Amino acid sequence: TIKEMPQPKTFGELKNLPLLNTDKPVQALMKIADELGEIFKFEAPGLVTRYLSSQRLIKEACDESRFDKNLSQALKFVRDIAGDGLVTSWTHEKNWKKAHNILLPSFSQQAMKGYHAMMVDIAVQLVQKWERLNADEHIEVPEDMTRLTLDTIGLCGFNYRFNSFYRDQPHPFITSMVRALDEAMNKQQRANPDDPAYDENKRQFQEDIKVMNDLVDKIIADRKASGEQSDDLLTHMLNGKDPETGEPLDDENIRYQIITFLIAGHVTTSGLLSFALYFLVKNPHVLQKAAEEAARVLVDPVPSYKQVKQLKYVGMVLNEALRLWPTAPAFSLYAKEDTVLGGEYPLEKGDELMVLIPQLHRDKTIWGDDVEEFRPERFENPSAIPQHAFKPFGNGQRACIGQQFALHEATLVLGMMLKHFDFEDHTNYELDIKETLTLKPEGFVVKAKSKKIPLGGIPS
Numbered sequence: 206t207i208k209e210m211p212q213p214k215t216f217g218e219l220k221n222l223p224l225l226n227t228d229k230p231v232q233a234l235m236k237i238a239d240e241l242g243e244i245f246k247f248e249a250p251g252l253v254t255r256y257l258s259s260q261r262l263i264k265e266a267c268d269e270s271r272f273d274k275n276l277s278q279a280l281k282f283v284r285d286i287a288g289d290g291l292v293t294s295w296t297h298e299k300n301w302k303k304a305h306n307i308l309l310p311s312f313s314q315q316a317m318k319g320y321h322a323m324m325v326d327i328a329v330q331l332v333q334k335w336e337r338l339n340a341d342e343h344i345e346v347p348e349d350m351t352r353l354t355l356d357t358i359g360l361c362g363f364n365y366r367f368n369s370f371y372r373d374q375p376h377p378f379i380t381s382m383v384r385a386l387d388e389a390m391n392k393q394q395r396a397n398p399d400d401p402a403y404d405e406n407k408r409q410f411q412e413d414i415k416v417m418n419d420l421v422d423k424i425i426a427d428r429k430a431s432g433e434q435s436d437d438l439l440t441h442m443l444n445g446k447d448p449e450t451g452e453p454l455d456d457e458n459i460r461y462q463i464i465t466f467l468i469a470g471h472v473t474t475s476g477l478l479s480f481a482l483y484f485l486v487k488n489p490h491v492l493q494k495a496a497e498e499a500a501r502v503l504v505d506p507v508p509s510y511k512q513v514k515q516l517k518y519v520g521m522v523l524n525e526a527l528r529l530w531p532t533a534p535a536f537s538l539y540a541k542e543d544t545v546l547g548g549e550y551p552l553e554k555g556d557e558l559m560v561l562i563p564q565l566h567r568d569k570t571i572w573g574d575d576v577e578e579f580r581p582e583r584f585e586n587p588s589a590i591p592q593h594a595f596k597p598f599g600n601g602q603r604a605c606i607g608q609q610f611a612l613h614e615a616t617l618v619l620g621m622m623l624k625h626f627d628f629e630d631h632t633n634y635e636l637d638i639k640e641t642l643t644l645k646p647e648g649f650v651v652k653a654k655s656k657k658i659p660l661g662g663i664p665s
């Protein structure tokens with residue numbers, strides 16, 4: 206039964222904190238998991254947490270009756286940006302359940318059919334950008350994927366056009382958002398956050414948020430200027446009421462949800478698409494098989510909703526990309542009551558767990574020894590995979606609400622990418638994963654050759 210938990214090097218009162226003195230901390234928690242195993246203790250000033258890495262222990266952690274969602278120190282900081290929005294609010298603090306009930310219809314499958322036409326509107330824009338490049342020019346993949354995913358959630362969700370393909374540098378929203386999220390991640394290393402040395406950081410942050418909120422002001426303003434009726438994510442936000450309480454969303458809260466969905470609805474998807482395209486050019490026979498399916502299925506000028514759902518292997522490319530590098534690399538849980546995990550490590554009420562998603566997906570006692578290798582064929586049969594062995598979208602009633610939204614978009618775009626282009630690893634890119642809480646490959650550049658297949662029109 207019971208045994209004690211391994212713990213990495215400690216540095217006096219700082220405990221394990223100096224170990225995360227890196228701009229790549231998740232990949233460093235991976236270095237440690239490989240050392241100490243399926244579980245280890247991480248202490249910092251005024252916080253302890255247990256990092257899980259095995260399917261064995263994580264299967265237990267996803268028992269909603271034993272464990273509830275925890276706000277990690279990261280999310281506690283992000284809360285300064287997103288407030289008590291869907292992602293950063295407690296399960297029992299329910300402006301959550303209130304918003305959950307109000308918004309969940311916007312991700313009903315009848316709603317997905319509504320978004321598709323708008324998803325193609327942006328997807329066409331991406332393809333046309335690349336089909337209009339000159340032969341000497343490179344494609345900045347994560348940059349352009351971000352343009353695609355921001356504009357999609359912007360249109361589908363709020364009927365607002367960021368028009369990112371009409372812009373040189375990133376949208377002012379993106380610059381503020383990235384910098385503000387970098388602050389939340391970087392603040393995890395400050396032993397004294399309120400030292401006046403970080404006054405410049407506190408000042409930049411309040412201005413970054415000023416910028417993000419003045420965009421939200423635009424979205425709501427343009428909305429009350431009417432556009433006949435709408436039933437997108439923003440409409441249900443303004444007019445929907447929680448059946449349990451008969452109450453609509455607080456004014457302070459509708460703003461937090463817009464911020465939430467603008468951020469949460471695109472950073473991990475562009476990350477996914479950038480990781481997917483990366484793996485394809487590093488495994489050309491996988492790229493071929495995927496491109497062949499793309500050509501075989503997408504026969505009309507623009508993809509139909511049904512056609513996207515027929516791209517099974519393109520879906521497998523995505524899931525495998527999410528396996529090797531889940532772009533939301535971790536989520537937290539707390540013990541509802543006293544209990545014992547894996548019958549070996551006893552936990553007190555309110556103790557904190559971290560599910561290290563990249564290490565879960567490298568569990569050799571689930572996936573084989575060929576963990577690091579990119580084989581989409583693992584997902585050829587969903588029925589096979591044990592539950593809680595694959596968790597890129599979290600768990601339970603607080604798993605990703607936008608999961609179907611992300612995968613439908615990603616498959617659609619990746620579909621059109623393979624139908625319309627060949628891809629050359631122009632720089633022989635060495636994978637350099639950048640962390641802003643989320644994961645994305647930085648500096649990734651490809652070259653595209655057009656297959657010269659015309660495009661049609663757009664429904665929306």
Ligand code: HEM
Nearest residue numbers: 291292469470473474477533536598599603605606607611
């Ligand atoms: C590949 C893309 C995505 C990944 C990997 C991902 C991952 C996740 C994860 C792990 C969680 C749980 C967080 C936690 O347990 O602390 C989550 C929740 C959430 N996601 Fe996603 N997500 C993706 C795309 C999206 C999209 C497209 C949307 C669009 C709206 C979205 C909106 C949300 C929201 C609102 C929550 C919180 C829901 C709740 O807990 O009530 N995500 N996501």
Ligand code: NI
Nearest residue numbers: 206207548549
């Ligand atoms: Ni025993």
Ligand code: NI
Nearest residue numbers: 341342343631
């Ligand atoms: Ni070149």
Ligand code: NI
Nearest residue numbers: 489490491493
């Ligand atoms: Ni061959």
